[PDB]
Paper text:
Indeed, species conservation analysis of the HOIP-interacting region in SPATA2 (aa 212–356) revealed a highly conserved putative PIM, Asp-Leu-Tyr-Thr, between amino acid residues 336 and 339, which is similar to the OTULIN PIM (Asp-Met-Tyr-Arg) (Elliott et al., 2014, Schaeffer et al., 2014). Two complexes in the asymmetric unit of the HOIP PUB-SPATA2 PIM crystals are highly similar (RMSD 0.7 Å), and while they crystallized in a distinct space group as compared to the HOIP PUB-OTULIN PIM crystals (P43 as compared to P61), the PIM peptides overlay perfectly and occupy the PIM pocket in a virtually identical manner. In contrast to p97, both SPATA2 and OTULIN constitute internal PIMs, in which residues extending C terminally make additional contacts. The structurally highly similar binding mode was also confirmed by biophysical binding measurements using fluorescently labeled PIM peptides and analyzing their binding to purified PUB domains by fluorescence polarization (FP). The SPATA2 or OTULIN PIM peptides displayed binding affinities of ∼300 nM with the HOIP PUB domain, but did not interact with PUB domains of PNGase or UBXN6 in this assay. In line with the in vitro analysis, substitution of the conserved Tyr338 in the SPATA2 PIM to Ala (Y338A) or Phe (Y338F) largely abrogated the interaction of SPATA2 with HOIP in cells, without affecting SPATA2 binding to CYLD. Moreover, co-expression of V5-tagged HOIP and SPATA2 variants showed that the SPATA2 PIM is needed to co-immunoprecipitate CYLD and HOIP, demonstrating that the CYLD-SPATA2 complex is linked to LUBAC via the SPATA2 PIM-HOIP PUB interaction.
The linear ubiquitin chain assembly complex (LUBAC) regulates immune signaling, and its function is regulated by the deubiquitinases OTULIN and CYLD, which associate with the catalytic subunit HOIP. We here show that CYLD interacts with HOIP via spermatogenesis-associated protein 2 (SPATA2). SPATA2 interacts with CYLD through its non-canonical PUB domain, which binds the catalytic CYLD USP domain in a CYLD B-box-dependent manner. SPATA2 also harbors a conserved PUB-interacting motif that selectively docks into the HOIP PUB domain.
Author numbering:
A (entry chain A): 4 to 176
B (entry chain C): 334 to 341
Amino acid sequence: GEEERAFLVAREELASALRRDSGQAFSLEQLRPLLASSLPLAARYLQLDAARLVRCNAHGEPRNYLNTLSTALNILEKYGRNLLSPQRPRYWRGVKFNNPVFRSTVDAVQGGRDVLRLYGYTEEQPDGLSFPEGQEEPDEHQVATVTLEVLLLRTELSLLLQNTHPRQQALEQ
Amino acid sequence: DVDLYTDS
């Protein structure tokens, strides 16, 4: 009960900050409240389907697929911060499947494209995803919430790769 | 910066 409250206050504190300054770096001190929360993993990620993203990409050795996952998350985090930047890049409205970086990093993982739809790339074509032509601009609140969980999850996988997670034997599940 | 969008 009171654990959920502390979790959601820190959540909005970092998301708001990331909405002020899209390029704002966050330290492990600022993120420790979300990583160290007693809440289960399924309850600490509200937009991103973290349970699936980890399990559905455990192929080969952990040293391999955990780096493959961390990379996809790092790129996805950039997709999110780009939509929040005061000067959004041109072509921000659509991501085409044959883009080299997306193909070899994000598309290479199950659930990568689902994260783009969370950002607002909901309209699907045979060549990629794109925003609805009707929507003028990103939902700044939704983008910031998704980016934080991508940033957060990548951080959990980094701690495990360093073998220093608050509850490492937990996510071993 | 790195292009994450265009098919070309």
